[PDB]
Design a protein around this ligand. Structure first.
Ligand SMILES: [Mg+2]
Ligand SMILES: [Mg+2]
Ligand SMILES: [Mg+2]
Ligand code: NA
Ligand code: NA
Lengths: 249, 250
């Protein structure tokens, strides 16, 4: 019961609408009152056991289902936002887009329709694409990001800073948030890493981006990142992924 | 609380109370190999019994200078489990991850010899798995570590292989028997092009005398493609996901 054909389990989670959505809050250090949450996707097998994320994420690609799962995630997110601005909550969701989605001319038209249906507050959704993907497909990244702006969505680049000249890719994109890569967060006891981190963050602030620094695993890491100038932070010390959007912002 | 905490503090205490959990994911032979082979994976529960996401505690470890201590905990507990799983007809081999902090520590190798001296394991019971990026950043220490492992009758693997500028260059200077191909090569295998690249890569690994391991077998169609390509070993949830027990039927 810790095995299965993940490609078939995915084909059917889709058909029973049975993925599980999790939410990991993004914490504002500089006065953002939104309830920002990153959306994460989980999958259970028929026997109710969780399939390792790396495995079903790789399955989804092996099956050519990435884009179709993105649409399920987007529609269910749109749903939840509609149901959450129901109360006072200023919820904002960070939703991942696969490379397959990025390369797809059809995403934008499709999205415009769904958003119209839902009638959500503007700037309710942020689409997050990896640095590697934006860099592979700069032209499509450029097209997609301008498009989102017309729809009153925002964009984020994640795993930022690992490429040789990472700020170049940002030249023609419309992106408000930049989530720095996890590697920058390691061993900040070494003054040199504090400086690398600090200059990355300052360079981002200089290009007028909002920095998001992940993997805050204790209060000292949090304090260090606050001093370094981080706009937002995320990590288990604040809250790990949860099935509910119940974080006290 | 239920789903938050200071993971650095949790790690420091987990180390002291031995309350990490080891899981095992079978590495499965297509070329007969006698062994039960398992990859060792580390899990962590918070004090309230809820699982801390591995990426979060692996980062916490690096943030607190605890990576090598965690590796040593895993090694000792892996040695322990092997000696016990020997209590049966199980010719088990374990793949154990080494962090870049361990790879860099010249203290590692003599410490390893003491750990092994005490446990009386069959030779070639442990394979130490280093990522390509780590091996490539620290090639001198990887050369030294891997020659040393052979002296200790251990083996070595490079994982996420095939992503660096010239992947086969690093291999010239290391003592490594297993090569675990990066998952990037296992995508879109639907496409004949990607099948041929993978097939070629595996063939080249064979030429260079390495045993290839291909991860992310997520269905029969993927297994089917990999079979054809002559992979020495495979791994994935379609065969068996990580489990708390070494009870796969090889
Ligand atoms: Mg299938
Ligand atoms: Mg996250
Ligand atoms: Mg594994
Ligand atoms: Na945008
Ligand atoms: Na700082």
């Amino acid at each position: 019961m810790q095995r299965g054909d993940v490609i078939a389990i995915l084909q059917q989670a889709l058909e029973t609408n049975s993925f599980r959505l999790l939410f990991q809050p993004v914490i504002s250090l500089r006065g953002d009152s939104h309830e920002n949450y990153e959306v994460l996707l989980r999958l259970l097998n028929p026997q109710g056991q969780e399939v390792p994320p790396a495995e079903f994420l790789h399955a989804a690609k092996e099956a050519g289902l990435a884009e179709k799962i993105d649409r399920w995630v987007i529609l269910n997110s749109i749903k939840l936002l509609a149901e959450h601005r129901a109360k006072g909550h200023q919820t904002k969701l960070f939703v991942h887009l696969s490379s397959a989605s990025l390369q797809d001319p059809g995403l934008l038209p499709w999205l415009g329709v769904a958003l119209k249906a839902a009638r959500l507050p503007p700037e309710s959704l942020v689409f997050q694409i990896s640095e590697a993907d934006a860099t592979s497909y700069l032209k499509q990244a450029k097209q997609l990001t301008q498009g989102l702006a017309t729809l009153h969505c925002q964009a984020a680049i994640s795993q930022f800073g690992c490429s040789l000249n990472p700020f170049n890719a940002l030249k023609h994109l419309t992106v408000q948030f930049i989530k720095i890569d996890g590697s920058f967060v390691q061993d900040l006891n070494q003054v040199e890493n504090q400086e690398i981190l600090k200059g990355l963050i300052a360079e981002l602030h200089e290009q007028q981006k909002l920095s998001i620094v992940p993997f805050v695993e204790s209060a000292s890491v949090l304090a260090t990142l606050w001093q370094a100038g981080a706009t937002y932070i995320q990590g288990y010390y604040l809250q790990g992924p949860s099935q509910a959007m119940d974080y006290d912002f």
